[PDB]
């Protein structure tokens, strides 16, 4: 029937893309994440994995390789990469935990 499920990974990427697309259409250019859009994502649906709302630009300027204030699909995915790392690495120096 209609609405048939896809492969595990295909379903997983569809979910994140859906959330990515909804936030990539807040300011403009539904494909990239602007300053407010990028911050709106973390300061709403990600206050646990990464607790930082005061130095968001610190992340943007460390992920954007072109520095145009608009995190493209590739640049935005860079956040997800480090996010998945921060769940296993965290602060492997003093305290990590989960």
């Amino acid at each position: 029937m209609a609405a048939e499920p896809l492969t595990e990974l295909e379903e997983s990427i569809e979910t994140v893309v859906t959330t990515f697309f909804t936030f990539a259409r807040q300011e403009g250019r539904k494909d990239s994440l602007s300053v407010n859009e990028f911050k709106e994502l973390v300061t709403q649906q990600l206050p646990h994995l990464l607790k930082d709302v005061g130095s968001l630009d610190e992340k943007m300027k460390s992920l954007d390789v072109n520095q145009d204030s608009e995190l493209k699909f590739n640049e935005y995915w860079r956040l997800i990469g480090e996010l998945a790392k921060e769940i296993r690495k965290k602060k492997d120096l003093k305290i990590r935990k989960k």
């Binding site: 607790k51 005061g54 965290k90 120096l93 003093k94």
Partner: protein, 128 residues
């Protein structure tokens, strides 16, 4: 109350009429930022005087900052009798409502400006 120890050296200037507050380092600082770390930056405050307010560089992710910032205690030596400087260390975890993890105060009336006041003052966690 415990916040560690702060090594500092105070010298007086008679040309600009102020006390040179130069701190060396602070150790045994408590952690605030999740992960056993903190962003402790000392900011000097005063009593009703309020003729001075300087914040040091944000020492992000550290428990022992070594920068040796210079604070200009803009107040005539003649007004040191009724002037008590307080050094409060603030955290900057950049998420939670970080506050004063500790502070220290010294009555300049008791302290003489004969030469230099170099010592290792103990810090206390005087929460607000």
């Amino acid at each position: 109350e415990k916040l560690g120890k702060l090594q500092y050296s105070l010298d007086y200037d008679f040309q600009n009429n102020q006390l040179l507050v130069g701190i060396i380092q602070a150790a045994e600082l408590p952690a605030l930022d999740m992960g056993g770390t903190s962003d402790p930056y000392v900011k000097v405050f005063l009593l009703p005087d309020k003729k001075k307010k300087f914040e040091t560089k944000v020492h992000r992710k550290t428990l022992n900052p070594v920068f040796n910032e210079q604070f200009t205690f803009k107040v005539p030596y003649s007004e040191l009798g009724g002037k008590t400087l307080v050094m409060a260390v603030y955290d900057f975890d950049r998420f939670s409502k970080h506050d004063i993890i500790g502070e220290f105060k010294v009555p300049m009336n008791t302290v003489d400006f004969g030469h230099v006041t170099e010592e290792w003052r103990d810090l206390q966690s005087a929460e607000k």
